[PDB]
């Protein structure tokens, strides 16, 4: 995360940390969100270069990447589902969403705690407005030109950007479609970055934190006129219900 502050999972207790196994400790690879006790949502691009469920391990309840955290829970991936129309197109990703069924060494799904909670999915519809300020979180880089990653969780606040604005040529032109969500900082100083992908974009809808987007792409980090782009979760609700329901 560029900008924002360092924080503890207790402030993003749906955050899921997805690592890849090694031939020998596992490598942090990207973020995700606990959308139900057995199911983590993330980005499909996180799994392409090796799409085998046995190669991944999911930790819930972590403030510090790649070390033990009190109240941590470690899960194997029972089932790995990538969207059927996932696709890379030279600038960006499309239909960039994945579902992971998680399970412990002893069979259990996620056990709630102050550091492990689920996050709500957006409603089909809702009347009554809400704010366009939404939260991001992850272990991504703190600046686009860093080598090296922070090792401790960070969080920040960005504003949603209208499709129309995001589609202006100065922004991302016709690469942006109705299945995507754009979010940036109005003064271009806080953003998600490399290593934040798959992680959540938390808006506050009908009074509760809501998973409105998944970190998918953007040119650099906190660059002027280059918002972060998120899978628009509300668009995939029926797809999500048909798999986890």
């Amino acid at each position: 995360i560029v900008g924002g502050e360092f924080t503890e999972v207790e402030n993003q207790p749906w955050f899921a940390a997805i690592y890849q196994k090694n031939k020998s400790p596992p490598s942090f690879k990207c973020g995700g969100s606990l959308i139900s006790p057995c199911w983590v949502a993330s980005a499909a691009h996180c799994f392409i270069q090796l799409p085998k469920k046995e190669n991944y391990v999911v930790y819930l309840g972590q403030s510090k990447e790649s070390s033990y955290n009190p109240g941590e829970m470690k899960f194997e991936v029972e089932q790995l589902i990538l969207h059927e129309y996932y696709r890379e197109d030279s600038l960006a990703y499309h239909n960039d969403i994945a579902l992971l069924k998680i399970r412990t060494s002893t069979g259990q799904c996620a056990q709630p705690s102050r550091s492990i909670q689920t996050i709500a999915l957006p409603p089909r519809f809702t009347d009554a407005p809400f704010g366009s300020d939404c939260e991001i979180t992850g272990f991504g880089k703190e600046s686009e030109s860093d080598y090296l990653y922070p090792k401790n969780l960070k969080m920040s606040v960005v504003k949603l950007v209208s499709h129309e604005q995001c589609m202006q040529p100065h922004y991302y032109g016709s690469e942006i479609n109705y299945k995507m969500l754009c979010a940036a900082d109005p003064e271009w100083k806080t953003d998600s970055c490399k290593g934040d992908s798959g992680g959540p974009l938390i808006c506050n809808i009908e009074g509760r934190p809501t998973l409105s987007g998944i970190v998918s792409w953007g040119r650099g980090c906190a660059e002027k006129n280059k918002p972060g782009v998120y899978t628009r979760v509300s668009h995939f609700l029926d797809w999500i219900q048909s798999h986890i329901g």
């Binding site: 942090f28 690879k29 990207c30 980005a43 691009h45 996180c46 270069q49 890379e88 197109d89 030279s90 600038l91 960006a92 990703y93 991504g140 998600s192 970055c193 490399k194 290593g195 934040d196 992908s197 970190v215 998918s216 792409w217 953007g218 040119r219 980090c221 972060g228 782009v229």
Partner: peptide, 10 residues
């Protein structure tokens, strides 16, 4: 990897 990726593996 598409150019505007924010993936650690790109």
């Amino acid at each position: 990897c598409p150019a505007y990726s924010r993936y650690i593996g790109c």
